[PDB]
Amino acid sequence: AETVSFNFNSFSEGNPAINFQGDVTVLSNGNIQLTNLNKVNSVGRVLYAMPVRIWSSATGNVASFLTSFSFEMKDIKDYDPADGIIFFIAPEDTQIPAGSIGGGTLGVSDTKGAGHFVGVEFDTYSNSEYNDPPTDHVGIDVNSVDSVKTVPWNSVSGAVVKVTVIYDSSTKTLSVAVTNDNGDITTIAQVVDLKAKLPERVKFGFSASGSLGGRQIHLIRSWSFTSTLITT
Amino acid sequence: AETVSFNFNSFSEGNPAINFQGDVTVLSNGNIQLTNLNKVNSVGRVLYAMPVRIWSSATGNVASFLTSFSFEMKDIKDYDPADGIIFFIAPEDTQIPAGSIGGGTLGVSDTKGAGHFVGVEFDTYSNSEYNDPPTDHVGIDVNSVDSVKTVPWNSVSGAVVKVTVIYDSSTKTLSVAVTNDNGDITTIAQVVDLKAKLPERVKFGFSASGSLGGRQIHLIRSWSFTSTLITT
Amino acid sequence: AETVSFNFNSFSEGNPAINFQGDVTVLSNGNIQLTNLNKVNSVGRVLYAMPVRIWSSATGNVASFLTSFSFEMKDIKDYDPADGIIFFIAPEDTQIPAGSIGGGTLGVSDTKGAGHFVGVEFDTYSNSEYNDPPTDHVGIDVNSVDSVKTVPWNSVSGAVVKVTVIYDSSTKTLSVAVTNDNGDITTIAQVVDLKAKLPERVKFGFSASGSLGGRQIHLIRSWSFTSTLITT
Amino acid sequence: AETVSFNFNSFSEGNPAINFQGDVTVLSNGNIQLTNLNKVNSVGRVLYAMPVRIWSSATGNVASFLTSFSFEMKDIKDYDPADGIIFFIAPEDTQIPAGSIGGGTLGVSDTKGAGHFVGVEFDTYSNSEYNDPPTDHVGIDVNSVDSVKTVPWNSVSGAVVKVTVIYDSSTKTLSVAVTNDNGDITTIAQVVDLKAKLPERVKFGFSASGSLGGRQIHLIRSWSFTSTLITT
Ligand SMILES: CC(=O)N[C@@H]1[C@@H](O)[C@@H](O)[C@@H](CO[C@@H]2O[C@H](CO)[C@H](O)[C@H](O)[C@H]2O)O[C@@H]1O
Ligand SMILES: OC[C@H]1O[C@@H](O)[C@H](O)[C@@H](O)[C@H]1O
Ligand SMILES: OC[C@H]1O[C@@H](O)[C@H](O)[C@@H](O)[C@H]1O
Ligand SMILES: OC[C@H]1O[C@@H](O)[C@H](O)[C@@H](O)[C@H]1O
Ligand SMILES: [Ca+2]
Numbered sequence: 001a002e003t004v005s006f007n008f009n010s011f012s013e014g015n016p017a018i019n020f021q022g023d024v025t026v027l028s029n030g031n032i033q034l035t036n037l038n039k040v041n042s043v044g045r046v047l048y049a050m051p052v053r054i055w056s057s058a059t060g061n062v063a064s065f066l067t068s069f070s071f072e073m074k075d076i077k078d079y080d081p082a083d084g085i086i087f088f089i090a091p092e093d094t095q096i097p098a099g100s101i102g103g104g105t106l107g108v109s110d111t112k113g114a115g116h117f118v119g120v121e122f123d124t125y126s127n128s129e130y131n132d133p134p135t136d137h138v139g140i141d142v143n144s145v146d147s148v149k150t151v152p153w154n155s156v157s158g159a160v161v162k163v164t165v166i167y168d169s170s171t172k173t174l175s176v177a178v179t180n181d182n183g184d185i186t187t188i189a190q191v192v193d194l195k196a197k198l199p200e201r202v203k204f205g206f207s208a209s210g211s212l213g214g215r216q217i218h219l220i221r222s223w224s225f226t227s228t229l230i231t232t
Numbered sequence: 233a234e235t236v237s238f239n240f241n242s243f244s245e246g247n248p249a250i251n252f253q254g255d256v257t258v259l260s261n262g263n264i265q266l267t268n269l270n271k272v273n274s275v276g277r278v279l280y281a282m283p284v285r286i287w288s289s290a291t292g293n294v295a296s297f298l299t300s301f302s303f304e305m306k307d308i309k310d311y312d313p314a315d316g317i318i319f320f321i322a323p324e325d326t327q328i329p330a331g332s333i334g335g336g337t338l339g340v341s342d343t344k345g346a347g348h349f350v351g352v353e354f355d356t357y358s359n360s361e362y363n364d365p366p367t368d369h370v371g372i373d374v375n376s377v378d379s380v381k382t383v384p385w386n387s388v389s390g391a392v393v394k395v396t397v398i399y400d401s402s403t404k405t406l407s408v409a410v411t412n413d414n415g416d417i418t419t420i421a422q423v424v425d426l427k428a429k430l431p432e433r434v435k436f437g438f439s440a441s442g443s444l445g446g447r448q449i450h451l452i453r454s455w456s457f458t459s460t461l462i463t464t
Numbered sequence: 465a466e467t468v469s470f471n472f473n474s475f476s477e478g479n480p481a482i483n484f485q486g487d488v489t490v491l492s493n494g495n496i497q498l499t500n501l502n503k504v505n506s507v508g509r510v511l512y513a514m515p516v517r518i519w520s521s522a523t524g525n526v527a528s529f530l531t532s533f534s535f536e537m538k539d540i541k542d543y544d545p546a547d548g549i550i551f552f553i554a555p556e557d558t559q560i561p562a563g564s565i566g567g568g569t570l571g572v573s574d575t576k577g578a579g580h581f582v583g584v585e586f587d588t589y590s591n592s593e594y595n596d597p598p599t600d601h602v603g604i605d606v607n608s609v610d611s612v613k614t615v616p617w618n619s620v621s622g623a624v625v626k627v628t629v630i631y632d633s634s635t636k637t638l639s640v641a642v643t644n645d646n647g648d649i650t651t652i653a654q655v656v657d658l659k660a661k662l663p664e665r666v667k668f669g670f671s672a673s674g675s676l677g678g679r680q681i682h683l684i685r686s687w688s689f690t691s692t693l694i695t696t
Numbered sequence: 697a698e699t700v701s702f703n704f705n706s707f708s709e710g711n712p713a714i715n716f717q718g719d720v721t722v723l724s725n726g727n728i729q730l731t732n733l734n735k736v737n738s739v740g741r742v743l744y745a746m747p748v749r750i751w752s753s754a755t756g757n758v759a760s761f762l763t764s765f766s767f768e769m770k771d772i773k774d775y776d777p778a779d780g781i782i783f784f785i786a787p788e789d790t791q792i793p794a795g796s797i798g799g800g801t802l803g804v805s806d807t808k809g810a811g812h813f814v815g816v817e818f819d820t821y822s823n824s825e826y827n828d829p830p831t832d833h834v835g836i837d838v839n840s841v842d843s844v845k846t847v848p849w850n851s852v853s854g855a856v857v858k859v860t861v862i863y864d865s866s867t868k869t870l871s872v873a874v875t876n877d878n879g880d881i882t883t884i885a886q887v888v889d890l891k892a893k894l895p896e897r898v899k900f901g902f903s904a905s906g907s908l909g910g911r912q913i914h915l916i917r918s919w920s921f922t923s924t925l926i927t928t
């Protein structure tokens with residue numbers, strides 16, 4: 001078997017173990033702040049520097065992974081609390097889309113909402129152009145911000161949120177669990193054939209965006225990960 | 233929103249939140265020891281004392297849940313290292329089956345291997361009478377120790393094992409993530425309609441068993457849990 | 465350590481984690497209504513169905529606890545707005561006293577006003593037989609509705625009240641902070657030895673009562689709680 | 697009645713509602729970071745700009761208050777996680793002690809550990825020169841970091857801690873409740889005559905300090921407060 005595992009209790013701008021793209025910054029408290037509040041159509045992303053091999057061209061085997069992370073989103077005067085954070089998987093050469101308008105694209109898609117990635121978004125603004133639900137929601141995205149499936153959710157300002165994600169390669173199922181502020185959990189699962197949607201080696205990371213009037217604090221507090229690919 | 237959440241970092245015999253059944257004992261370090269090393273066909277089970285409402289007969293809604301736990305199995309001189317541990321869900325009046333032979337039944341089924349429960353087993357002995365795979369394995373059981381599905385796994389003597397489970401009510405998916413000694417993860421997921429398999433009120437817990445020749449130390453070290461049922 | 469914690473933002477009938485006694489009811493809005501407006505000497509109580517271990521006879525240790533809740537009392541035609549609500553603690557076999565007259569007993573004591581419980585009352589009627597102050601008030605009750613101590617308070621019809629109670633086992637101090645509708649706080653603290661007044665296992669909850677002419681809407685809207693007993 | 701009440705979900709150095717002293721900085725995420733990680737004997741404090749009238753020389757009455765806050769301390773390399781945060785009350789003209797050495801002084805006392813203030817410390821280092829318990833502890837201090845009383849407590853790096861404090865006027869009791877990462881709650885209470893120990897007008901606030909080798913992230917995330925003084 002081939003395993004990739006890491007853990008971040010804190011983040012440091014200097015550490016090369018992570019790629020910083022766009023407006024991302026690292027606060028003195030070790031928190032990764034994805035977007036710049038004083039910028040229009042801001043976009044910031046972070047990827048685990050080491051590309052992870054999710055499937056073998058020799059066997060056809062796809063890896064399973066268990067990952068958990070905690071983030072925080074807080075409102076600011078005077079802007080709509082937008083746009084949200086998305087935990088994504090993409091080609092290792094992934095970079096913020098050219099001419100990104102941020103906002104509802106969440107830093108991973110073009111204006112039409114399309115891009116090459118698979119992710120779990122924590123959306124805090126209803127974009128009708130991307131067919132978003134009416135309330136805050138968590139969604140499974142496959143090459144588009146027009147979610148394959150979504151689930152009602154509530155983004156509480158200044159609340160630490162914990163997420164646990166399990167991908168089981170045999171059933172090709174991606175299961176998510178979000179632990180809210182009131183103590184309630186919110187789950188969402190979807191079958192997604194990663195090998196069919198993504199290349200052999202990829203990068204995992206987070207992205208967040210904003211617009212002219214849509215802005216809020218997007219923070220990544222921690223992140224643990226373990227992927228295992230059967231090589232036999 | 234109806235939620236049940238608890239977190240055991242250790243245990244005590246006087247903790248009312250825990251129902252002890254069979255040969256269960258509590259070690260001075262807070263660990264629960266499920267089987268008696270000196271008894272033939274030993275059986276021990278521990279349960280969260282409070283019955284949990286997993287689905288509504290009024291709305292048809294089914295709860296989602298996130299639960300994590302860590303156990304440890306250790307060989308002893310010089311019995312066969314058997315039989316294993318099973319995280320189960322069963323009717324609130326669940327009790328060790330009458331005339332339990334322990335062993336491959338894992339304390340949750342009858343001689344034929346049937347019973348009323350849903351669970352994730354960590355099997356260390358291949359019982360041909362229950363169609364077990366040839367090696368240790370993690371299984372998803374529904375009313376029977378003859379697993380609906382299993383995955384190859386390896387139980388390391390004296391190794392602390394971490395497990396995270398996610399049940400998504402919408403897709404009825406029960407996904408398990410097992411973190412091994414060497415940091416490798418093993419996963420298994422299966423669609424299981426709890427509403428169709430179990431009554432509205434149930435109890436969650438752990439069970440382990442041995443036989444005359446098959447014995448080993450079965451320890452439950454910690455357990456956190458959160459179930460949420462959408463109501464009104 | 466042994467901890468019991470929970471958080472209710474609303475309530476629903478059927479939740480096995482709650483014991484309903486008497487005339488209690490759950491409204492469509494998740495609120496718990498303690499008394500029946502058409503019944504003479506009405507009494508309704510709600511208890512967390514999980515017994516809480518407040519002290520150990522083995523170690524002699526006593527638990528500490530933090531709890532918060534919000535309630536609302538609202539007048540009705542043509543009865544006197546009575547009798548009030550009491551947050552209480554009693555033996556786990558606690559039931560509404562047999563042949564209760566409700567009224568000023570607040571559903572936890574006998575006709576003389578005696579009982580086996582400890583609690584914080586929110587009194588809206590002056591019962592001279594129990595030496596009540598002449599106006600509305602918050603009181604600390606130890607085995608009697610004839611409060612060991614009281615502080616002038618005022619129950620505003622329809623006002624949502626917030627309460628926070630801290631019990632420090634070391635000093636045996638029970639402090640209460642009541643946040644009125646107009647933003648003012650009212651506090652009352654009393655040294656109460658729970659190890660000396662209650663058994664090792666108890667149940668927490670609320671009770672409200674009325675009489676023939678004294679009636680009113682008694683609502684419990686939320687309730688969070690955390691008690692910890694050191695077992696080391 | 698005279699009541700003061702406020703609430704901060706986020707902080708800003710451009711806001712007049714707060715005084716900033718020393719190395720205190722406000723991160724882009726809204727958190728207040730009390731100590732500078734790059735300075736020796738660092739010290740930073742903040743105070744609610746408006747002095748709170750806690751007692752009257754005309755009537756002798758003393759105010760009761762309920763205040764809760766959340767903070768965060770996180771380790772860093774290669775320094776000892778020190779020294780801690782202290783929520784204090786002091787003369788309205790309080791200032792960082794002249795020639796402060798930070799460290800165990802928590803930024804409120806002199807080298808001897810004496811000063812004019814009442815506070816609740818969250819101590820993460822054992823200074824023998826101040827008779828500190830051998831482990832992390834929460835203490836009630838009255839004009840000295842040589843705590844009047846302490847209770848064992850575990851400071852978890854990167855964990856958000858919630859605190860609730862109630863000062864009962866009549867009993868002159870100050871009781872505190874702290875929420876741990878494991879879920880357990882910790883409390884400590886002590887009788888403190890604010891009238892005798894502090895002036896009529898005071899300021900409430902937080903302070904944290906570090907040394908040459910002792911440094912860590914000291915964050916203040918939110919703070920609500922309500923005090924009521926009877927004027928009659
Ligand atoms: C009545 C009878 O035929 N007896 C048989 C024994 O001969 C032998 O087959 C045992 C095997 O029990 C299993 O033992 C292992 C360990 O060595 C595990 O504990 C299995 O779960 C057991 O079933 O069964 C009867 O006693
Ligand atoms: O007001 C806020 C919003 O503004 C829109 O212009 C943008 O497309 C949305 O994604 C969101 O940022
Ligand atoms: O008029 C109202 C009141 O009536 C009394 O008879 C009763 O004892 C009081 O507790 C209160 O209900
Ligand atoms: O190692 C760290 C510590 O070092 C001491 O010298 C200092 O007095 C303490 O307050 C703390 O800073
Ligand atoms: Ca959107």
Ligand SMILES: [Ca+2]
Nearest residue numbers: 336355357359
């Ligand atoms: Ca078996």
Ligand SMILES: [Ca+2]
Nearest residue numbers: 568587589591
């Ligand atoms: Ca009365």
Ligand SMILES: [Ca+2]
Nearest residue numbers: 800821822823
């Ligand atoms: Ca110290």
Ligand SMILES: [Mn+2]
Nearest residue numbers: 123132139145
């Ligand atoms: Mn969306």
Ligand SMILES: [Mn+2]
Nearest residue numbers: 355364371379
């Ligand atoms: Mn099996």
Ligand SMILES: [Mn+2]
Nearest residue numbers: 587596603611
């Ligand atoms: Mn009274």
Ligand SMILES: [Mn+2]
Nearest residue numbers: 819828835843
């Ligand atoms: Mn100290």
